[PDB]
Amino acid sequence: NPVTKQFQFGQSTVTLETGRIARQATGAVLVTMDDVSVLVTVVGAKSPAEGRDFFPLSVHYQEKTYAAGRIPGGFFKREGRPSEKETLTSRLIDRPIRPLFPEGFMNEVQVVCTVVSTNKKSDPDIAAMIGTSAALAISGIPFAGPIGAARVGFHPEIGYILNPTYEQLQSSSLDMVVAGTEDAVLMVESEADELTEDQMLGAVLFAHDEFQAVIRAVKELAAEAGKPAWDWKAPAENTVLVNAIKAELGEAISQAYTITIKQDRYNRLGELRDQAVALFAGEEEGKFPASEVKDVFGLLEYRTVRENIVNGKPRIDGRDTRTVRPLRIEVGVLGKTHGSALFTRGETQALVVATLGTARDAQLLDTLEGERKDAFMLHYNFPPFSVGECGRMGSPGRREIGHGRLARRGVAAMLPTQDEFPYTIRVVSEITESNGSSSMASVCGASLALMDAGVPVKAPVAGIAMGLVKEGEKFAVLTDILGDEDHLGDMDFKVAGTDKGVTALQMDIKINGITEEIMEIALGQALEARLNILGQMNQVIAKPRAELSENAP
C-alpha cells in the first residue's frame, strides 16, 4: 500500500511517501529532502457551508522541537502559539496555492505541514512546499496543476545556488524563494544585497527552470497513488444578464469612473447599481435573483476599470501609469525618540521610530536549529484607523508579521554589523494612513529614521509597490499602486532597494503569460520610480547624523 517515489531535485534526493501515515486525510505525504522530513496533510470539506461567500483556505506550518532532538524551551516545555518563522512559512505556502483553486470553490481546505525530522543544516520549508504540492495532487480536491518551489542563493563565483543550506546562505548575496507551476511563476519572496534587476530576474528564471523536477515527480505520484477527482462543477456564467447590464446601464459605469473624487464617484456608481438592479433585478424572465444582478454589475465594473487602464486612460485618481503620488517627508517629528520619520506618499502615511539599546535588549529567537540573538527588530503596526474603520486592537496578525518582514527584508542589507555598531536596534513602523503599499512606506520611513537616529547605515533605501494589468496581448504597468487597484491587477510586485541595486523583491502573479520581457519592463519602471523617491528623500536627510542621538546609549 505504501507508494514511495524518489526523485533528484538538484543534487538532493527527495522521497515522497504516501499510503502509510495519515490515511484518513484527503491527502497526506511524507517528504524527506536532505535529512529533513515533513508530514504534509490536506483535508477538504465534503460539502460547502450554507451561506459561505468566501473560500476558507487555511495553512498551518509547524516545527516540532523533537525533530531537532530538543525539549521545548519555556515554562511549559511544550510548543505553543506559532512563532514568527512558522507564520511566515504558513504565508509562503498559502500565497501560491490560493490562486490555483478554481473560481467558485467554497469548500473548506486545511493544509497542515509538520516538520518531524531535521539535521539542522537546511531550512525545512521547501520540503513543506513540495509536500503541499504532492498532497494536493493525490487528494483529488479541485486544484490547478502541481506546483513547485525552490530557494535560490547567489555567490559571485559559483553563481546561483539551488536550495542553499544555512551555511551556504551566510556568504550569499541573495535569499530568494520562488514558487510556480509548470508554465508560470506564481510567487517570489526575496532579499538581496543590492543586486541588479537582471541578477534578480535571472534568479527567478533559474528557480523556475529548476523545480520542474518537483512538478514531474508530483505528476507521476498523482498518476500512481491519486484519489478519484472530486465531481465539482464550476457554476456557469449569466451570459445573458452580463451582456444585458453591459448595455442597459453600462455607459454610466464608463462615465462614473471618470471622476477622481472618491465620494462623488462612489455615489454616482451606487446610484447606477440601484437603477440597474431594479431595471433587471435577477434574471429577466422572473427577475428573481438579488445579489446576482448586483455582482454581475460588479463584474462589469472590474472589466471597465481594467479595460480603461489598458487602453491608456487616466486612472481612478487621475494619474498616468508612471506617476508617483506626491511625497511629504519629515525627520525628527517626535521630541524624545532616538530616531523618527513621518513619510507620506499621497494618502499613505507611516510614522517610523528607531530606538537603540544594549546587548541585553536583543531578542532570543528559540529556533528549531538552536537559539539565536536577533539584534535588529522591525515591528510593523497597522491600526484600523489608518483605513477609517473600527476593529480589533490586539496582537499582530499574519498580515502585519509578513508586512514587517518585507520591510525588514528591504532595509536589512544597509544595517551595520555588530562590529561596526555594537547596539540593538528596534524600528517600529506605525501605519497611520493606508491607501496603497504601507510596507514600502515603512521601508522609506525606516531608512529615514535610522539615518536620523545616527545609525551608520550604508545608504538610503526606498521601496515602491507596483502592479500589472494584462488584457490579452496589451499590458499596462502601474506605478505606486493604490489600495483600490491592489485587487484589480494581474501581477502586484514590491521592489525595495538603494540607487545601486535591489535589496528585496516580492511578486505575486495570478495569470499565465507574463514573459521575461514584461518583467524586465516592469522592473525598469520600478527602478525609475525608486530613484525618483530616493532623490526626493535625499533632499531631507542624505547621510546618518554626524553624532548619535542625545538619548541613546
Binding site: 559571485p156 553563481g159 546561483y160 543590492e194 543586486l195 537582471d198 541578477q199 535571472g202 533559474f206 527552470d209
Partner: peptide, 25 residues
C-alpha cells in the same frame, strides 16, 4: 568585484540559451 558588479552568471538560463544559440548557429 562586488556581487552588483558581476554580470550574468554562467548557470543563468538565459546565458545557457545564448551559448547554445551560438554553438548551434
Amino acid at each position: 568585484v562586488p556581487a552588483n558588479a558581476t554580470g550574468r552568471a554562467l548557470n543563468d538560463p538565459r546565458e545557457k540559451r545564448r551559448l547554445q544559440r551560438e554553438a548551434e548557429r
